[model samples]
Target: RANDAPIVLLHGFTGWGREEMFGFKYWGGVRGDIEQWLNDNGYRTYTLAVGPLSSNWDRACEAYAQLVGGTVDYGAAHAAKYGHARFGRTYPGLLPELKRGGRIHIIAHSQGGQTARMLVSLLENGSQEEREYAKAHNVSLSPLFEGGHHFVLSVTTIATPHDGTTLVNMVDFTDRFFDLQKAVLKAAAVASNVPYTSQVYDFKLDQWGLRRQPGESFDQYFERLKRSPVWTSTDTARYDLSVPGAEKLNQWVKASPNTYYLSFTTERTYRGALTGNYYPELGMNAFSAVVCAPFLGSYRNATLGIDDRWLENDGIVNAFSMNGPKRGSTDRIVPYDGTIKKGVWNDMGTYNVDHLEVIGVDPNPLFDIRAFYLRLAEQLASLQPHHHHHH
Candidate 1:
């Protein structure tokens, strides 16, 4: 079967694209480039890099503009509310048009999953705030805010924190994350004029006024951003990945009736009988066990329901939170019954892999990451060309 739907690759928190890190792929960190493999298998893949640590709203907007080749607009109303620039960089576009029956399949990871959902919601449901602001200001608005557009065939999320993680309250991990990227970021071959999007500290944060000014050293820029008030606000990836932040987004960003939904979850933790606390599996990834598993495994929160079910994680995100959104959301989620349906989360089942394994960063994967995606691509290609779209 032939499928015209192209695959758009979206990286999650601290994820890069085809252009960065001297061609080391974000899709395949240690194994190799998964996108290239998929491309060779006849899948048209486009890896888009948004604000890796920005708010879901910001990341969503970036993804939309990158596909359609429009200037990234965070929406006039949203920009004012968040106190940032209303527009970001203009892209050359990957998918390009909203042609009839020319929908795309989105393969988003971690925070990028939230971005994918955020995008389609705006595409179909539109934004009341933006709509009202557009008419009042009498300016041209991106069709994205008007709704009635169905450019996405389906959305598949891998190891996503759909319900947010309890590990967020344990400590602030962004500073160290930024520092880790500091040295890795300095040796990049990027500017513009490239197919891949690179919105790290250099280009992504200027919307929040975080870009380093001319004559400023890397140290100065990094320190200034760390101390800035951006971290204190809900308009950040830090907040978006938090339970409260995810709740806010889930309340409004809904599952559209026009598209198909699927989620891939991962787990690498086991429960303790005596303490009733979760612990890393014996063969769990070393980094997950040492750096993140302990925090996520033993964490607790009463009101947010971060007790037993929430503690089990795939290192970076709660396994319970990965299947699909539920708390504070009305989106329908269920196990994949072998029949492709619309407007519902067809659960793709859970895997015994870690967050890294699903993305090809694992040394030895029990679950075949490349084969899983290749099969998924074939399955998506078999889907009917859903029609009746408008703006």
Candidate 2:
């Protein structure tokens, strides 16, 4: 339903909050502060910087706490399942008004979409296991676990891997090319640890007993993030971002009938008309083009579901995966017209940009990321409470 609901901006895989990155901004990189722009345009907006390497469960929990207020409760069963603390640091609340029926729109990029779904589901459905666990422990539970809330108005995802990214499959550590994971996280940790004012990049791994110490060196922190047992289990983002992991997640984290879902896909790579191999086109980001696109674009392991359509990508995520959740998900991904139906992913069509460019780290002048987001804000603001069904 439509309201002047605050828009929450969620960053994808290994992203930081507005406070971190030395004010470089994850929403815009060096371009412009997207959140500020939204606020400036009369739309209330909040950018969430949840755990970059955490699983959807953890990220969702952290986001709930940040927005709805209170300590981040990972929930009893989930914390037990993941081998981490049940409760995390508290926040003063970004949109505490949501408790009394206030609604919000979630605009997520990349894996953040998975997080958005998880949060919305948790808010409505709660955790049966967590409630049961709280019963056993004789302890009170967070309202988050109690569920039965209708707090989300809509969920909009840009370049999100609804099913999963072939990039993770391509970098399969099971086949033993796991060092790339190290290199990638090292880069994040390095940036996260970059000392600055107000907010330094944090791993938010305190639940795992892995928060970097005051005098800790890079080697020490990197070692902790790399060696954490969370990696071995499916409790980390590494697993959840994989094809196998997303398939498992799709089992439970389905769409909510109370929320509108719109997925915006992106593409900056092309597949050979004759050869059928996908390759990143020029103007795509160097990191994605060089490291991610090559592997995911020319992917192997085309199996029961994998097809030629999965080969084309936006330098990082396969464009096919970005449209909406498929393969493992139960939600509908229909082409968008004017209908903003609730409960299913209304495919909002594809953007001809790469993953980062879709947000703000633009390399292509062809795509107006700023104006695009503003237009999106207006569209979301225009939504009315309770839509109708088609014949």
Candidate 3:
């Protein structure tokens, strides 16, 4: 049967199936309720509770096998089997339905964006193991049956680290804290039957530094972003994803031809200070400059190289990284403040939303998170070809 709400809900790191963290829990485990809601609204939904909470991208791929296989292997037994394969298979439960011609749309949150991309990429161009698993499970994807696109439609990532985040660099130290954190994560993974990594939390930090751009001649370490218009100036708020087709560690997977990528961005940066929740003097705003610095770049090849664009980051991911396809005008940069911030502006506009507020569970969401999803759901439901309008 054709579905208007064919979708999958992916979760972020450190998320769990329990609700003890201040009424917080991962949507994967509790997704049945949401799936039912969508079903009532004329949609089919699936949820994958990739456990062990906050696993890294590499490790998370291994978990995909379980999701496809419809089983949990905490021994990481599937890792060796799925590793380096062209078509990675972790989930085999959906094979029967897919073989009957079903389409899927993915609505992912936080790092779920990365998960969604990895899933699609694997389906399109995974290694031998992935392909073999699909064949054994009676499922077929791109480069195999070549009709997978008709089965998968759109991909939406909320606050996803599409582009790499500097917070990822926060794991720069090998301290007692990291050791403890690793131990705890490892134990949890063993219990949950999923791989684990603290990189998710590490990428959450906002104060790490990248080298200055526009050719800095000094060997000074930057505790704060160095100021240079060429490096830090922005005519627009959305930046592009990092180096498309640029020596990716995982290049066997090709970009999906059937998937449409859309990303929601926020304008507010360093809200712990802007809002009354935290004060600057309390070391909360320590990462403020880097967030708004506009000079988001890297220090590779023994020199500082700057990205020629701007971003609406939630102190984590910039706009460019959130959208995919390796390359395209697939970016949609909207302002969180609902108006232009003033200055020969090329990007940044009114979206009536902020970075931290779009997630639906923040202190005060600009628009309720459920509202955001339902709106997206409707849009997916509509499937209007000429409806591709951008603000």
Candidate 4:
């Protein structure tokens, strides 16, 4: 199958694009880069680089600017509150096909999935709150919410923590994810002989766009946050991956009726033969085993107070979470596989692999990763309008 539509690949947390000078790749860890393989097989693919530790809101805005080949506007209202500049680098002619009503496919991993979801939502349905905020601040609205849905055809997420990750839940501290960053910052401050306040470590009011001017009303504060530059923290991903945080985001970002939603999951563990409970052991590489074993054991047969479904993980995200949010009312997994519903999430299938394997990390020799992508490309191409309805 041949399709001219471009494909966008999004990396997960701590992930860098092909241009980044990073030692280890978030997509292709020790194995190899997936983009190279896709390109070799005749897929015109592009990898996006967004903030590694930024919140979904920030990452989504970054993605929008990159896709449209325009200057990144974190929003005028946001730059005023936060310390960073309002605009970032520009990506020119990144998606020329989009200007002609050509639809592109989005494939994401880990937190990138959430970023894609947020972007699609903002594209299809401009946020009323954000529009009002732009008016209040007398700043231009971010182009991200300018109804760009016609440019998207489908979104596929691999090993994404759509619901929430147990890793954040296991670590009770809000700043658990950023402990290392905090330590490094503290070390730098001490070496420079500069004392920093504890508030620097805690979530700042300005970071959440809650910083208020003198006599600013609560309503105004809420509105300002709509356009506020999203401040990133070590806790941002953890907060977004938390049950409450994910729930809040889901209420705003939803499946688009025009786009197909697909998801893939991996399992690094298996059910205990005796206990019948899923345990994080076996099938995982040495590194994943070492990291996940303790986290899994800490919750087994104990009251960690987390949902049992979260116990089944791929050394990182829970398998259940990868499928998509449970129905708000029924608490049931949304149908995805059998009927091929549009504007709803569907599970492609769970692979007997680890989280890293999705990106060809220490890939199983038995499973042909190249062939797998070739088939995926063909399947996606087949879904395009020209391929489906020969008009």
Q: What is the C-alpha local distance difference test score of each model?
A: 0.77, 0.79, 0.40, 0.63
True-vs-predicted CA distance for residue 245, candidate 3, Å: 12
Full ranking by TM-score: 2, 1, 4, 3
- Best candidate (score: lDDT): 2
* Candidate 2 local distance difference test against the native: 0.79
Sort order, lDDT high to low: 2, 1, 4, 3
In model 2, what are the clashing residue pairs, if there are any? 1-385, 2-385
Give the alpha carbon lDDT tens digit for every residue of 1-391 in model 3.
2235367766654343333222233342212245456666666666655532222333244344433444322122233332322333345654345446655677776666666665665555445554565667665433322223344466666766555433333333213213323332332332212222322212211111233334332122122222321113221011112233111422433345555555654434332434222111111122323332222222122221214232334543444454432333333344334321111111222233333335433234234555556666775665432233378
Candidate 4 lDDT tens digits, 1-391: 5456778888765465564433344456556667777778778888888765567776777788788778777666555644655676577746866766777889898778888888888788866766677888787877665565666788888888887666765553333334323322332232212333221221223234344455543234334533444423323555677666777677777888788788888777877667655666555655456654446433532353365566777776778778876524122345544445567677788877767666765456656676766676766776635334344
Q: What is candidate 2's lDDT per residue for 1-391, written digit by digit as tens?
A: 2468889999877577776655667787646789999899899998888887789989999999998788898887888777789888889988879887799999999899999999999999998998999999887788888889888999999988887887776544432223433333343343323333333557687788777666665444555666775566678887888878888888889999889899998888777888788888888876677677887777767463677788888876777877777867888888888866778888888778887777666546777778999989988898888665669
For residues 148-266, could you state the per-residue lDDT of candidate 1 as single tens digits? 88889899898898888776776657654454345234323322222233333433775886765655655556567667645667788889888988888889988888788889988
lDDT winner between candidates 2 and 4? 2
Best by TM-score: 2
Global Cα lDDT for candidate 1 = 0.77
TM-score of candidate 1 against the unseen true structure: 0.89
Q: How far off is model 1, as Cα RMSD?
A: 4.9
Query: TM-score for each prediction?
Result: 0.89, 0.91, 0.52, 0.76
Per-model RMSD to reference = 4.9, 3.2, 13.4, 8.7
